[model samples]
Target: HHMIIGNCLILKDFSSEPFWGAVEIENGTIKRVLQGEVKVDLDLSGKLVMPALFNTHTHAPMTLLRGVAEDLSFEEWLFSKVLPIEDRLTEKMAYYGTILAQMEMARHGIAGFVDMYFHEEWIAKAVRDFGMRALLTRGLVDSNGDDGGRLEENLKLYNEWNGFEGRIFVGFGPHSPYLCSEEYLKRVFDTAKSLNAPVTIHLYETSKEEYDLEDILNIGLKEVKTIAAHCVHLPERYFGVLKDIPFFVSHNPASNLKLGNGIAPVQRMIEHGMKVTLGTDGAASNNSLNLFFEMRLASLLQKAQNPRNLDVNTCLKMVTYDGAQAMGFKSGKIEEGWNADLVVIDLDLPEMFPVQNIKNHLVHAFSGEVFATMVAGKWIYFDGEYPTIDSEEVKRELARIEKELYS
Candidate 1:
């Protein structure tokens, strides 16, 4: 419907520079992006444009618990607080919570994300209302021994809402290695394969899980269309097994550290030729669901650990191109023939001042706080307002939900 012309820097792909440019989009796909500004109805000559970022892992509705259970051990936090409160969540509450999470992500210029949690049908509904693309998975836990019932729920979700709204997709989410037995995992994987749905799971998130994988070979999956979140302390052989898998190895740096889970060897994973991607995990663990924050952390941590001429542009590509490839999206770069899900940053922001080198500031300074963001060539969050959702309503709902939880 429109074109974004500005002082642009297009990252065509990994190993490529801004090289100076402008990008064009027709309908929902990028038409062309060329250098030097041409005449257009809207001229944003002072702003800089880039592809909107993707978040690979999250439990969106947990935004309600963002700061509630901080500074605790993972086991202590999960058993003492998370599960107890989650058991109390009603469908309406989950919907309200998802809206809050979407608001936070949208405010920070996230184009899409992958979610693993309950009330997924409502999550899909919220995604539709908010104009954010998402892969919603109803997280499965076999602690109850009701694997068959849970498998049915997974099928229901896929049948009811996979590929909904031309943006949302359904995937299978096994809660974690310790929580889900190999038998349960196999059934879920088999079912997902039969239905052609993707699988997501928290793998090796804690040091405690390492002992269990000794007995089960496929316990920490490295194959199939799997999304392995956490992997905080996975062994090197796990990478070898996972090397051939068409899956996203999601890293949630902040959540791992915050929950006292060990740091994921993400840079090592990247070096091993694994399909590395970034995620915010659940807002409860992250205290925020901003991919911009995760991307910067992933980049800086990798470079800091091994400052061997690691390119900042390359790190940005992991969050963009590599992330898109993991999620099976055709967008992630501003190129001749890619989806026009873009973001325009007001490069003059205080953080990006003195842009000695634009990419440096983008990685070290510029967060996802963009002036405008587009999805499928549509400005979902343009200027200041969300396209269709009333952000204040979600805020009020969040307040009400929190108040009810506390009282």
Candidate 2:
């Protein structure tokens, strides 16, 4: 099937400014990019079309624990609160919780995201039905050299659901260096290497985790498409090495700050020619899977320390092109031959006035609502509605789980 989308301010990619144009799509890929208005399948005359946002790191079902653990250290939060609550999650709750989080992600225009959590198959099913692109992983934690069946679950998830509908992928989440021994962590990465699957892990998120972070890197973390988030204490020495490994960094500003983990050296990493992407971590810490807030916080945090760098355009790339590169998605731009992953923003929204500097407004000012969201030329969220998911049903299930967990 062929479709034409036009009559909107089109941002082909972060390499250039938004232009008035149209795109022709066929079978989930953009076939043509035409200049100016044209007859269209979707008339978005007053809207702006851009590459959809990408959240490189997140824990989908953790939204259920959003307010459950607060005002605590990372260790305390994980052991005393988060894990105990996690112990109560059933497969159905995991599915419904993941769906509820996907609702927010779609509503906010995130076309692709990477998730790390347990209840492997349910999370996979949630992404399958939601119609968004995702890199799914089972969080792997181990004390002994053995992964305690977690790695098997991850591989099981991979075997069964890696490329379902060509919209979802399976990956590995090693958790962190300290949580797993060097031997165990290497096994996790080696297993990912065997499958050629993408991997993500917590980097130097805290001052105490510094040595283990360096130790893992020293032992050779090259290979395996990896994402390291919250490098709050990552020294400058490992930059060249990691950049050489060509690892992608997911900078989660809100989550790091909320946990008092300190801001990452994102700007420095960028200067060293690293591919830094954006993420919301998880709702348990960010409390909202809002890329807009992360983008704004990321830029401001870097600016306060090093004001000359990390411009609006760079911030845009952190969520778009860079994120796509990290997550292995064929999007991040509304260009020909690319997957038709795009977001429509209402330019007439109250916060989007004086749209002279559209890019800056996108990064800093606009934080209201997503007009519509599309993934692979399919409309998942359109005009304040979800075509793929039952929003009310998800909310109801989430409420029941909430009462069950809290009460």
Candidate 3:
């Protein structure tokens, strides 16, 4: 029984269409996105309505370590500073950190995201509190012996937390190729098959991971459903391996470049017919939970790197539909019977002006600030006000935590 009308535009098959639509909701499902200016009640002025974004891969709670130890190479940062600080993080800190990160995502019109981190229970609680959709994974790193036990623990989490609601989903997270062994990867693969869940993993993320591909393919673990984060320097054979699999490849351009890691061959991955998606990685590397920045980096990187006929619509799909499919969500397009996870962007913004091309505006011109954010038949953020999260309180606590953790 809600109607949203504005300077509406939606992406439909690489073309922009008039979408100043009314979202009719009954129960929770988005019943219909009606055409014909059904401006019954909601007076949405100067906003572009589109599907809310999906952050296909991330470690949500790392917001606490945003600027804790920046300006170091990836390996040195992870070993000396990041891992040490992470070892010290209690569940409570993770809870607040999730809050801060999710709030940031929400602010930027991100409706759902897939996250890998420790303390699953805290993450679930934070997702519930924020009233947002999340795919939660308890990242598994082989801690010597009890690899079997750890696999079972991951399974238990999957069973207990699966279908947390239409809002929360859980998945298996194998920390990375280098951190997990073939035996463990097999277990995770089997578990995902049994549960019909998605497997999120770090693959070929760095030079050190060159050897893990042999282990991955040796165990008959081919054609797996996965979200491979940062395949930066994966070998040519591994690129062939990617072609056989139907999974998501998430690009965290800013995060990768910030860590002194070279850019992933995302353009090549897309060309390989792999599903490409975007993510912020985490605030620790990105220093902001802004998918807008991620989209810009990804779009510009690929366009500038490879002189293919790259355009805004192509990159928009990476951030939107492709991302939603990767994260196992119902919403990602402007269609009937999908979850009402949507955004209302302002078309009047200086960057979004002149109506050069709607898709171009969204990709090249628009930032996250171009309007409101909605999810599941509700306005999580409207006209710069967030209904589900206390933005000011989060800002205060974020500052407080920055001091407590870093200073």
Candidate 4:
């Protein structure tokens, strides 16, 4: 799978500017970048190439429940709608829903993501065929002292599919502090450490049922590489505690706003040097998994407070490099020896014009103008086609599942 994508506008990273150059990819990784002309397998003459977007937190199978529960309290949304629907979800439904999400996400330039959901093996299966990187973990909830073998399922997930094709990674997810007891949290983290796997969990999203932040992290996240999603109501005192231990905070701005949850202190989080990244929580709540939409909303919410806050470069990084760093993915940079996970945007689009300030346009301007998206030097999506997916079959199954679930 050695190939060249030549004669294009290349962006090295979020901090750097774009240049007219080419890239060499071999065996699913970038070999080099060329400043001089050379032969190419794909000539992206009018395309802008940059690292693909990464979703550091999402429930991929929740695509089935998109718009199913809205205009309700977070509590009601969960207990009355989301939880009830999930109780009836089958592995097959999860698979098809994730397939739909994968298609939608790839079109939106997402080549890698972190998934916390039921049927995570289905998440793995979809990612496998779709040619994207993913960190998969089933949500673990042990509040009733029996978690339906979910923790065991996570181990099975890891044992069965870890390190597949250098694209799939595994982790432990204990759902949230409220859902799992402190003692159970310790157990989860212990298992994670013993297995040498990363951990992720919902943290501090609500003020109800959950234990204090300091208490939870001290007990639940000892020395484990952690990705804590939704720290919207975090106390300032706990920031130092989190810093001492180290973790990646996934900011889901769209879900926060839609759920009536308070906006996370992402701007402050960055100032404190916390590694903050963006995510669309799930299609069910946020109702869209599009990274471009997430990017715009994330910046706009912060900008309302101060125009100078949370600029486009940082926003772009949150969705790409920072998310990749959090998920332990090899992609997110168009550099030598990096996985060739690239998003090619059409520069001919109206909004993409005046691309003098490229990074600025990446966050503030473009939407749905992606020419192609690649993972590991291979094209997953190109010219409005999903190369690795049977999109029509996915759509038909989705409609049947929609009827099955809704009826």
Candidate 5:
């Protein structure tokens, strides 16, 4: 089936000024972008169409644990409260929690995301049900002394779900250097190399994860593509070493600040030509999955250091195209041959009134008031409702899970 969206301001690329045009999506790929008037199925006269947001890193199932462990040190919060709750989480709970995340992300115009968590089979099921694209990986750890079983589980997940319906990609996720030994990392790297798969991991998220930077880099310097999340405390001297690495840096500004991990040197990383991407971490840390908020904080955090740097355009790319590039996916642009993952924003909203600069308003003023969200040329969210899933029921499930865990 061919779908045409016409009479709208098309954000053709990573730019502020949009052009009046129409888009033709055929068979899950953008077939053409017409510049003039054209007959269409959907008329978006008052909307702004652009590439949908992609969260390069997150733990989607953690939506169940949001606001669960607050006001505690990062390590204490993770080990004492979060892990205990996770230990008690059933598969059904994780599925509903992930559904809640998918619904929230769709509302915020996120067409796709990268998630690392345990019981990721449930996450994959939720993602499939919600009609979103994702890179799902099992969070691997050797803390329990069963490293072999965990590796087997990760490989089983990768083999089973890597290309599920062409919507899910699997990867190797060794929680971090602190949790996994060097031998385990070697095994992961070797397997990743054999499978030709991508890798995602937590690295130098806080000062505590700062001890084994050299060892961590040693492992990541392999042939596998990597996405390192929360690179908040990497030292200045080591920045040069990362310049030539075949990996991306996932900058989670809100989560870093909220968890007392200082701001990442993203501008410096950009200066070094590193592919920097944005992530929301998880609802438990950031309390929200909206990329617009993350982009604002990403720009402001760097702009505070030097007023003339880290502009809105760079931040926008971080959440959109750069993220896609890191994931080795062809998306984050409104061009031919790219994935038909797009979003429509209501420009008549008060937050967008008197918009002098489109990019400025989008980054600084807009509050994720999206009119529609599309993935794989399909409208999952339209007219403030999810056509594919029951969002209200998911929210109610989350509430019930919250009560079961806390009360």
Candidate 6:
């Protein structure tokens, strides 16, 4: 289907300002962006249209674990609470949980995300049903001296789900360097190389977690696309190594702060020319999947050191274009030939009023008010409704699952 949206302000590609224009979409790809109004089916007179948001890292099914292990030390939260619950997690539970997560994300204008979790096939099923793009991977932790078939699971996932529908891409997730031994890391990297797949891993998430920067750099040397998440505590000396690598670092400010892990040195990393992206981690730690709030928290947390540090434009890019680049997707910007994934924001909201400077408001004053969300030239969320899934049923199912999990 082809569609055109006209008579609105367009924030094209994280520019310093928005312009009054119209966009044309045909067959799931952007075809034209004109500077003047045009006759169109949708008249977005009071809305701001822009490229949709992308979450660089997340555990989608962990929505079921939200608030399950709050107010505890990182060690206790992960080992005593999260791990034990994960041991009892079923595919049915993960599917419902991911459905709930998809509903939240679609409402918030997130068209795509990167996720690592157990039962990723079920999560992929949810993504397929929800009409969202994702890079799905099964979490691998070989600390028990046996992977318990994690390697085989990753292989099966890559073979079956990688490049599915040009929307679902599969990758290898080695939990982190601390959990996987050096030999096992080699094995994982070898499989990744054989399949030419991307890798997503947790690294330096806490003060106690150890990561050998040299080893990580060596993996990068082999040309394996890698995204390292929750890198909250890396030494400055490691910056030299990271700067030379073709990899990405995902900053999870809300989750890190909530977990009592200090803020990551995103400013310094950016100065070193490292590619930095943003994520909300999981709803269990973040307690919400709202990237708007996450972006605000990320900017404010960095500004504490120096008011000029981590400006709004840079932070906005971290959530949109930078995140898309990190995940190897072509849909983060408004341009011809890019994916027609976008969000419509009602500018008449009190918080969005008096748009003297639109970019500034988007970063600082904007609320999470998404009028509609589009993916692949289609409206997944429009006027508070999801055309693809039963959102109310998903919410009720989540309530039931929460009770069962907590009880």
Q: Write the per-residue lDDT of candidate 4 for residues 126-199, one digit (tens) a residue.
A: 88988889999889989656777999999999999999999999998888888887777888888888888888
lDDT of 3 by residue, 1-407 (tens): 45544434544323456455565655456666666566545655455677788897888889888787777888788898889889777787788899878778877889889998888778888888877788888788774434645666666667777788788788888888668766767777777777777788877777666575667665434555688788777676566666666667888888888887778877776676667788888787888888877897787877777666346777777777778888778777777777777777777767766775666677777776636777777777776676877878877877777777766
Tens digits of per-residue lDDT for model 5 on 166-264? 788999888887788777777787788889898898888888765756775666454678889988887777777676767788899999999898899
Against the true structure, whose TM-score is highest?
2
lDDT of 6 by residue, 114-142 (tens): 99888988999999998988988888879
Relative to the true structure, how large is the alpha-carbon lDDT of every model? 0.76, 0.86, 0.74, 0.85, 0.85, 0.85
* 237: Cα error in model 5, Å: 2.3
**Count of steric clashes across candidates, in order:** 1, 0, 3, 0, 0, 0
Model 4: lowest-lDDT 10 consecutive positions: 207-216
Alpha-carbon shift of residue 76 in model 3 (angstroms): 1.1
Worst 10 residues of 3 by lDDT: 5-14
| Over 4 Å off, model 4 | 220-222
Question: Compared to the true structure, candidate 6 yields what TM-score?
Answer: 0.96
What tens digits encode model 2's per-residue C-alpha lDDT throughout 297-373?
89999899867778988888888888988888889988888989988998987678788877888887988378998
CA RMSD for every model? Answer: 2.3, 1.4, 2.4, 1.5, 1.7, 1.5
Candidate 1 lDDT score relative to the true structure: 0.76
What are the clashing pairs of model 5? Answer: none
- Displacement of residue 213 (Cα, Å) in model 1 is 5.3
lDDT (tens digit, per residue) of candidate 1 on 1-407: 76756545555655565555677778788887777655554566667778887888999889877777877888788899898888888788878888878777876777888898887888888888777788888889885466646767767878988887568888898887678876777777777777767788898888877654444346424344887898887887766656676767888998988888867887777777788788898877888887778877777666677775336766677777777776778878787778887877776778877766777777778766778877787778878777768778767877788889877
Query: What TM-score goes with each of the models?
Result: 0.93, 0.97, 0.91, 0.96, 0.96, 0.96
lDDT at position 383, candidate 1: 80
